[PDB]
Amino acid sequence: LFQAEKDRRVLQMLRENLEEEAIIMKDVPDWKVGESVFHTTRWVTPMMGELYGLRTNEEILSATYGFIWYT
Amino acid sequence: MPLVYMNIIMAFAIALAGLLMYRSHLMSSLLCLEGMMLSLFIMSTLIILNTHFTLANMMPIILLVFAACEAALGLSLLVMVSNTYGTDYVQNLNLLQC
Amino acid sequence: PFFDVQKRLGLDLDRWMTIQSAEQPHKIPGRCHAFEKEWIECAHGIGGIRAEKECKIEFDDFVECLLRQKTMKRLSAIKRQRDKLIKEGKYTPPPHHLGKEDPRP
Amino acid sequence: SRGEYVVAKLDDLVNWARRSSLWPMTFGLACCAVEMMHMAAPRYDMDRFGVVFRASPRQSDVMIVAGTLTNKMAPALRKVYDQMPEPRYVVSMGSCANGGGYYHYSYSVVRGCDRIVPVDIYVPGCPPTAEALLYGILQLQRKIKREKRLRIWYRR
Amino acid sequence: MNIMLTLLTNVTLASLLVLIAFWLPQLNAYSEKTSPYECGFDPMGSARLPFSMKFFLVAITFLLFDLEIALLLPLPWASQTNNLKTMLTMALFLLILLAASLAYEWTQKGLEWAE
Amino acid sequence: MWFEILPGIAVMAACLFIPGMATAHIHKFTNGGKEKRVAHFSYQWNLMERDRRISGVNRYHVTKGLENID
Amino acid sequence: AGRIASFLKNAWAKEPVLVASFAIGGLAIILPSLSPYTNYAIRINRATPYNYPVPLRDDGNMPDVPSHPQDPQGPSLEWLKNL
Amino acid sequence: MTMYIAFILSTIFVIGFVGFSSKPSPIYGGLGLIVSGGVGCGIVLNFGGSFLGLMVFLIYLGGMLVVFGYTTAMATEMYPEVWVSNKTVFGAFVSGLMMEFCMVYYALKEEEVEIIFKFNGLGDWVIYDTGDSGFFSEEAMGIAALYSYGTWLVIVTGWSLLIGVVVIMEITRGN
Amino acid sequence: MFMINILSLIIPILLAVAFLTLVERKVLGYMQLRKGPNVVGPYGLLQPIADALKLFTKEPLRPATSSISMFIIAPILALSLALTMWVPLPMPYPLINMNLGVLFMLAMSSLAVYSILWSGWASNSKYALIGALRAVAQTISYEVTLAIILLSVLLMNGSYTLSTLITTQEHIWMIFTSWPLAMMWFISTLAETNRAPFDLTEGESELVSGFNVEYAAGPFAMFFMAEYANIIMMNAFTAILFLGASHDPHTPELYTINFVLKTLALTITFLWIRASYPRFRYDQLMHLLWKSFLPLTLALCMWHISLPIMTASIPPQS
Numbered sequence A: 001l002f003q004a005e006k007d008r009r010v011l012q013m014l015r016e017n018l019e020e021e022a023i024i025m026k027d028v029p030d031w032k033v034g035e036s037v038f039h040t041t042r043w044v045t046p047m048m049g050e051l052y053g054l055r056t057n058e059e060i061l062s063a064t065y066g067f068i069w070y071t
Numbered sequence B: 001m002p003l004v005y006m007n008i009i010m011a012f013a014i015a016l017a018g019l020l021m022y023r024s025h026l027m028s029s030l031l032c033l034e035g036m037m038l039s040l041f042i043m044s045t046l047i048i049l050n051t052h053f054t055l056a057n058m059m060p061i062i063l064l065v066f067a068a069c070e071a072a073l074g075l076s077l078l079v080m081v082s083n084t085y086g087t088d089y090v091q092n093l094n095l096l097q098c
Numbered sequence C: 001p002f003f004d005v006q007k008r009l010g011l012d013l014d015r016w017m018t019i020q021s022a023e024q025p026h027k028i029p030g031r032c033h034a035f036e037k038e039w040i041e042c043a044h045g046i047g048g049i050r051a052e053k054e055c056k057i058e059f060d061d062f063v064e065c066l067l068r069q070k071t072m073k074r075l076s077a078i079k080r081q082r083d084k085l086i087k088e089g090k091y092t093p094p095p096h097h098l099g100k101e102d103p104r105p
Numbered sequence D: 001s002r003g004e005y006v007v008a009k010l011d012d013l014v015n016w017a018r019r020s021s022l023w024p025m026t027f028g029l030a031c032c033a034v035e036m037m038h039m040a041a042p043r044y045d046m047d048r049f050g051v052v053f054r055a056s057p058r059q060s061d062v063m064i065v066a067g068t069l070t071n072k073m074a075p076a077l078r079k080v081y082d083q084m085p086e087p088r089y090v091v092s093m094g095s096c097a098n099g100g101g102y103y104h105y106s107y108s109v110v111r112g113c114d115r116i117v118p119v120d121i122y123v124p125g126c127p128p129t130a131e132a133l134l135y136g137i138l139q140l141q142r143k144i145k146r147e148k149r150l151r152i153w154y155r156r
Numbered sequence E: 001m002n003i004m005l006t007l008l009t010n011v012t013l014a015s016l017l018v019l020i021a022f023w024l025p026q027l028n029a030y031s032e033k034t035s036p037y038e039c040g041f042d043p044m045g046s047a048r049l050p051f052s053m054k055f056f057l058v059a060i061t062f063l064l065f066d067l068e069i070a071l072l073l074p075l076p077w078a079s080q081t082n083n084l085k086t087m088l089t090m091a092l093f094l095l096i097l098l099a100a101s102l103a104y105e106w107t108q109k110g111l112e113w114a115e
Numbered sequence F: 001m002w003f004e005i006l007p008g009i010a011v012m013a014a015c016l017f018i019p020g021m022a023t024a025h026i027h028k029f030t031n032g033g034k035e036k037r038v039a040h041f042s043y044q045w046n047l048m049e050r051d052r053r054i055s056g057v058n059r060y061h062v063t064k065g066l067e068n069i070d
Numbered sequence G: 001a002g003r004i005a006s007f008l009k010n011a012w013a014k015e016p017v018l019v020a021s022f023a024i025g026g027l028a029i030i031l032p033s034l035s036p037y038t039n040y041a042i043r044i045n046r047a048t049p050y051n052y053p054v055p056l057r058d059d060g061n062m063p064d065v066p067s068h069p070q071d072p073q074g075p076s077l078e079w080l081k082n083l
Numbered sequence H: 001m002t003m004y005i006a007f008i009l010s011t012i013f014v015i016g017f018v019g020f021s022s023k024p025s026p027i028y029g030g031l032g033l034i035v036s037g038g039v040g041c042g043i044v045l046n047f048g049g050s051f052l053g054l055m056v057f058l059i060y061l062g063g064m065l066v067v068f069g070y071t072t073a074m075a076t077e078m079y080p081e082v083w084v085s086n087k088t089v090f091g092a093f094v095s096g097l098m099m100e101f102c103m104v105y106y107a108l109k110e111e112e113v114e115i116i117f118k119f120n121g122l123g124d125w126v127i128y129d130t131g132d133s134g135f136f137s138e139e140a141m142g143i144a145a146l147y148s149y150g151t152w153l154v155i156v157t158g159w160s161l162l163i164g165v166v167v168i169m170e171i172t173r174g175n
Numbered sequence I: 001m002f003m004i005n006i007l008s009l010i011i012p013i014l015l016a017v018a019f020l021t022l023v024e025r026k027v028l029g030y031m032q033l034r035k036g037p038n039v040v041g042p043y044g045l046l047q048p049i050a051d052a053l054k055l056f057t058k059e060p061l062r063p064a065t066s067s068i069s070m071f072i073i074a075p076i077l078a079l080s081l082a083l084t085m086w087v088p089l090p091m092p093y094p095l096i097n098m099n100l101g102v103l104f105m106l107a108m109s110s111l112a113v114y115s116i117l118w119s120g121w122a123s124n125s126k127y128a129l130i131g132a133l134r135a136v137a138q139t140i141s142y143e144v145t146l147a148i149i150l151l152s153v154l155l156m157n158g159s160y161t162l163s164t165l166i167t168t169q170e171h172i173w174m175i176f177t178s179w180p181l182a183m184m185w186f187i188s189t190l191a192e193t194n195r196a197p198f199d200l201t202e203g204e205s206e207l208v209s210g211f212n213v214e215y216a217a218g219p220f221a222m223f224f225m226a227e228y229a230n231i232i233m234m235n236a237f238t239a240i241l242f243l244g245a246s247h248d249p250h251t252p253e254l255y256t257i258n259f260v261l262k263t264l265a266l267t268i269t270f271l272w273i274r275a276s277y278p279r280f281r282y283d284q285l286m287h288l289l290w291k292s293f294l295p296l297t298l299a300l301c302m303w304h305i306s307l308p309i310m311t312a313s314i315p316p317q318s
């Protein structure tokens, strides 16, 4: 169950980032929206700078150092 | 690379430069050697943690072991030099020329 | 130079620790297991010279996974354009990018 | 006045703390130091009053001159008196330290330690009993109870 | 974050105690008072002169014996492996090697201090 | 005593009681009264994060039982 | 057999610490090879499920693999409850 | 940009390295190396490496204690030098500080190849893992694998330590 | 709320140290056929307050020949480290919960020696220097065997987490399983805290005040507080490690009371030992720790590695 909901959460964050970047990056001339950086077409795990790249620094801090700093 | 990688590499370069230019005391150069060892430990640990290479987590311990061996060797040589001259100055090691 | 004593006797003195895709304890995977696996399989048995050219795509993907340079380049471009848009006041970022989302488990 | 009351109370508190925690130097010269040790012995137990010997001058509050001060010794006694942080007190114990005593007319004896350092209390005897030294210590405590440092500072 | 706050709090309290110790009382410093203590007589030489170490050989051995501690600390986790026969052989091999090194230095008079 | 040494020991014991009891009470006060969660591993941290998300008040301690599943 | 006994007695009379240390070390060296519960410890270590067991695809030719956790097939931990 | 904690720790690491590389005195150099060991422990801790950071800190504390004793025995003089007691030491220290600050500014405001490659910053949070699994520490399992996978490493390391004891005894024999 | 917890930890510890000074004086007095403090305050209850107020209103001296920066840094490091070494102790809950608490105590204690080292060097006097080199020798004597003893004892815990020690000893004290290690650990903690018969650094008869001879007033007081806090902390660590209290999750006060009683008993044993024995020579301490303790510790480490495997008694939490 945790695996299923983690998959849904990751996909939702990726879709939100995709839509907001499509809104933002229509101004520049030669930017394919949603373009990959890998030649392969298989699934790649997100880098966590791609899931939390457009969010507030509190969420970023909790996602990066939340477990390390919990004592 | 991130900023931390550049900072660790800069620390290594500074310690190497420190070793290369001798002042008077031999012990200072030994300290610079230990500093290079520490910088290498930090850099290797960061790289291994970032890539999640599980079996490579044990290499920095080996590095520390051989750093300790190197430091012991240097300290023994310093003891001998000081017993010969009553001082650990590198100026006294000038009996052999090129 | 190199005496392949390990290969001759079949000992495996250090080959177990050479690559990230080789039998980690508890089957814990490396972050770039698939990329290294594909690069190794693609370049196996063709020799070093041929491999440097014909497995350049897999190696480029593996290096991209390792260091993630293009990813940060793309992310920083996106963020720069977003900041430029908000500075002139033409973006209005969505509520779920400001902490007012509706979280899911 | 409020300020006078405050400084009087603070002076009382500081004086109580100083006199209840009196640490003498571990320092003796002659016969009188045996009576000093007997004052540290169980029967009198100077430690029960808060009085504890400490070897270092930097950690001492009182100097007890217990024995004859000779000319060879005077610079050392002065030196370890100078290295005591203030406030500091000196107790002169025995005839020898008081005015020379039995050796007052010798060529090699200081005629009283008060030629070298300032003295707060003089304990008579050759040697004074451990009880007499205890009386002198309690007299020094009562003298410390009487000082007015903050009141005099406020009156300035 | 919590450990950083704890470190900051402890260091701040110690620093404040030092500050109070140095600014509250009355200071009367003069040269005799601040001179070095050597039981009432002036010191002959400097305290910065070389001070011989009679146990120098044991100190170097401490550097090597300290690193074997780092090799032995992961042992609680190593006891959870499936091949307990290889791990137990290797743990005893390291400890036997460490006892042999102590036995060698002991018999060669390496533990005796220099005179 | 020899029984006059006891008051100092009692004062020391009272002083040493304070840290443990204070830590226990402060842990209970800031965690819903139920013994602050321990996360030595990433799985427990993930459980705590999941709990925080579904609580609706952004606090891991609030617990949603069977009444939250209609 | 007679000189070594005297050596042992002398060592016990002069260096009891070393005698105890060597005896403890030798016992620790040799006992684990003679114990029947070493394999029990290995089995207990092998029975700890740190990661998820990924199921196998049914090809219709695996009678020895259970189709449900409570089926009689598969390994058993009944030996552990009696320990 | 998140609290810059790792960047600050790495900068203090570089500062301690400059402190002991200027070589003011062995007593001061050991202090700088101790500070560097502490901040390096912190840097490694912030990446998940608790065991390795604590271990390196402990090891360098022991090493610096031995170095302090040896400095008192064999590397002293009447007036030990500090970073402001000598124009050479002060010049090296200031040069190191200015080089570090120049490199930091150069890589922070621009995106330039210093020597090896380029770097824009963004904080080292970006390249993190978002890995969600485990009742164990992966670093601990990797280090514990030294007794099941690293038999050859254990053999060579133990032999080298025994040889090091023999070697120091031979070197300091004198005669 | 966390700062309140930090304060509720650090202030009572300082009060306990202040009253431990009085308790030590009274125990030594009554073992010496005298009384000890009993005038300033009922039963000498106000003696620690008078001592502290006298020290902090007394002039602090900076030696003419001393390095001032290190001279001031050393006591700050001592007191802050003594305060910090308390945060991972479970009583029954720790202030800071660490995966590796024991290694944290090891590292912080091995850092604490630099307080004595640097104060003795920065004093720039001969007795202080002799005290500092005695500190170097003492650390070299005890460190390796202390670490190996800790590892041997923790091989039955299963981890380095301090809270697991409570559940490990749920039924029996760990002292019934490792009492030789307990004895060696007790002597090692006596040596680690510079306590009699191993109070070599101060060396009162031999070296006047030793490492802290130059120090006076408030700075001197900080060193004393750090040392006594270390006494209490090390005895609390010993009580947690070897005499495990039973913890009821719905009544932690019982655990706290029992643990405090045990650590007080161990501290009183420290004072008793001080009152009862003469001092070692500092080469004799090194010979004791390297020729008697080290071989036995290595043998017992081998035994404690082997025993759980032979008996199938390996602890959980890989």
Ligand SMILES: CCCCCCCCCCCCCCCCC[C@@H](O)O[C@H](CO[C@H](O)CCCCCCCCCCCCCCC)COP(=O)(O)OCC[N+](C)(C)C
Pocket: D009, D010, D012, D013, D016, I039, I041, I046, I049
């Ligand atoms: C907040 C932390 C910093 C400040 C710490 C302050 C600590 C609290 C203060 C402790 C108060 C107790 C001292 C008073 C006890 C004295 C008992 C009584 O005996 O004293 C008598 C009278 O005492 C003095 O006259 C006055 C003492 C107190 C002065 C006023 C109290 C001020 C308290 C204010 C505290 C604020 C501190 C400053 C904050 C910045 C004199 O008798 P004494 O000579 O002994 O005994 C003779 C010996 N015999 C009995 C055997 C024959």
Ligand SMILES: CCCCCCCCCCCCCCCCC[C@@H](O)O[C@H](CO[C@H](O)CCCCCCCCCCCCCCC)COP(=O)(O)OCC[N+](C)(C)C
Pocket: E013, E016, E017, E019, E020, E023, E024, E025, E026, E027
């Ligand atoms: C336990 C830890 C936490 C406790 C919390 C409290 C911490 C207190 C902070 C630590 C310091 C305590 C010491 C208290 C005594 C005062 C020391 C100093 O600050 O006072 C004078 C500071 O004054 C300076 O000398 C000059 C006067 C003020 C300087 C002007 C700077 C501009 C400020 C603007 C003032 C205008 C009005 C202020 C109100 C707005 C120094 O005088 P000095 O003789 O050397 O030092 C010896 C002090 N004696 C006399 C008591 C022995």
Ligand SMILES: CCCCCCCCCCCCCCCCC[C@@H](O)O[C@H](CO[C@H](O)CCCCCCCCCCCCCCC)COP(=O)(O)OCC[N+](C)(C)C
Pocket: C023, E083, E085, E086, E089, E093, E097, H148, H149, H151, H152, H155, H158, H159
């Ligand atoms: C031809 C001349 C021979 C004599 C000279 C030899 C010179 C080298 C010294 C020792 C020879 C090295 C050979 C041993 C290599 C170790 C690896 C091999 O033996 O397998 C191991 C078997 O280990 C065995 O215990 C053998 C090692 C026993 C070592 C005894 C000590 C010998 C060292 C003495 C010489 C070294 C220097 C002197 C110091 C004393 C691991 O087996 P296993 O765990 O199933 O599988 C691992 C893979 N997993 C993780 C997937 C499960």
Ligand SMILES: CCCCCCCC/C=C\CCCCCCCC(=O)O[C@H](COC(=O)CCCCCCC/C=C/CCCCCCCC)COP(=O)(O)OCCN
Pocket: E096, E099, E100, E102, E103, E106, E107, G008, G011, G014, G015, G018, G019, G021, G022, G023, G024, G025, G026, G029, I291, I295, I296, I298, I299
């Ligand atoms: C078989 C497994 C081995 C591993 C387990 C042991 C773990 C570690 C133990 C060894 C550590 C190093 C050994 C140190 C060797 C010391 C060498 C030495 O010099 O000995 C003399 C002492 O002389 C001796 O050699 C002592 C006697 C001989 C050795 C001790 C006993 C050896 C084995 C005896 C028992 C064997 C097994 C026990 C069987 C019990 C019988 C029922 C030391 O005294 P000094 O310091 O020189 O005194 C100077 C002041 N005048």
Ligand SMILES: CCCCCCCC/C=C\CCCCCCCC(=O)O[C@H](COC(=O)CCCCCCC/C=C/CCCCCCCC)COP(=O)(O)OCCN
Pocket: G014, G015, G017, G020, G024, I180, I182, I183, I184, I186, I187, I197, I238, I242, I273, I277, I288, I292, I296, I303
């Ligand atoms: C069935 C399998 C079991 C395996 C075997 C297990 C049984 C092993 C039995 C032996 C264990 C003995 C452990 C003792 C360790 C030290 C023994 C020793 O010999 O040390 C002394 C030294 O030990 C001391 O004297 C201690 C010095 C410091 C004394 C300080 C005060 C004494 C302590 C008071 C009581 C302490 C209580 C400890 C436990 C407290 C609770 C944790 C040696 O010194 P020397 O007589 O001079 O001879 C050496 C050269 N020939």
Ligand SMILES: COC1=C(OC)C(=O)C(CC=C(C)C)=C(C)C1=O
Pocket: D026, D036, D037, D040, D053, I204
């Ligand atoms: C136990 O505390 C004491 C001392 O400290 C060691 C002393 O020096 C002295 C003085 C006697 C010696 C020989 C100097 C006494 C009386 C004393 O009680």
Ligand code: SF4
Pocket: D030, D031, D032, D066, D067, D068, D093, D094, D095, D096, D097, D101, D102, D125, D126, D127, D128
């Ligand atoms: S006064 Fe009397 S007892 Fe005291 S030292 Fe002089 S001669 Fe001896």
